[PDB]
Amino acid sequence: RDPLLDALRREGALDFWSAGAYARGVPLSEPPQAL
């Protein structure tokens, strides 16, 4: 980001939702799908 007006809340939270994505091991990077 560059203007960073509100990203620290709304995208800051999304950056740790997407770290597990339904707390399911983020399927597209889970070991059974080999990255």
TrEMBL record:
Origin superkingdom: Viruses
Residue runs in coiled coils: none
The protein's role, per its UniProt record: Envelope glycoprotein necessary for proper maturation of gM and modulation of its membrane fusion activity. Also plays a critical role in virion morphogenesis.
Name of protein: Envelope glycoprotein N
Species of provenance: Bovine herpesvirus 1 (BoHV-1)
Gene label: UL49.5
